Amino acid sequence: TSRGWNDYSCKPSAAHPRPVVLVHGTFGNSIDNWLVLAPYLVNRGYCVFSLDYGQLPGVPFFHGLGPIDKSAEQLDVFVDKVLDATGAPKADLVGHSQGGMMPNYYLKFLGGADKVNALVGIAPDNHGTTLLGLTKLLPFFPGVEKFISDNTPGLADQVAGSPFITKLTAGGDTVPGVRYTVIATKYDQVVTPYRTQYLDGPNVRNVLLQDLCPVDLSEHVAIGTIDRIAFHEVANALDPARATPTTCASVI
Ligand SMILES: [Zn+2]
Ligand SMILES: [Zn+2]
Ligand SMILES: [Zn+2]
Ligand SMILES: [Zn+2]
What we know:
By secondary structure, the chain is an alpha/beta fold. It has one domain (about 1-250). It has helices spanning about 35-40, 70-85, 100, 105-110, 130-135, 155, 165-170, 210, 220-225, 230-240, and strands spanning about 5, 20-25, 45-50, 90-95, 115-120, 180-185, 205-210. Strand 2, helix 1 (about 35-40) and strand 3 (about 45-50) form a beta-alpha-beta unit. It starts with a strand and ends in a 14-residue tail after the last helix. The structure holds zinc ion (4 copies). One zinc ion binds near residues 76 and 80.
């Protein structure tokens, strides 16, 4: 097999020689965040893999809740396991929200630079957010509310000015060797101002969703779960040689 989703017998083809690792957001998991994007990439011939991270005992389905440094270590082990199995030298990473930000910890402090070619962030909180902003996720994930507080570490670590965010962004945003893409939406209600999602460096491409389609009004959750315009742009970043401009026509 040269395509699949969590199929560890998958072997990346010559057209798509790097396997893709998908990294969910806050309150997400390896399956539900990626019900549209994973098949979408499988149909374009990628070997796709998705991990669970930040699990809290007694809270199935809703992850990204444990300490984000520990989450980055889970990502570390998971990428090694995907590379050990596929044979490939490097993986490409796609992440939504927390999952677009957390891999920068792996890249910067756990030697992920070696093992990663590209990091694509969809609505990533790259310089953190507020607890108030994170509460705007709750209507999409009701039932998680009773198991969390302001001290839930996966939430507190995302707060702009936290010890975690301070450590992560003390130096520059990027690490040499890696191609970074950020896809943001101006209607983001969770991570504001939305420009703080953007990365800075020589090898960064920041993209505003509404530049691609002016009438795509996706907010924070939609952009990383169901938005095919966003996902077309993800497919461009994963294979820049065969990229084609993303317009409203990608909505199907
Ligand atoms: Zn499910
Ligand atoms: Zn899970
Ligand atoms: Zn390692
Ligand atoms: Zn920065």
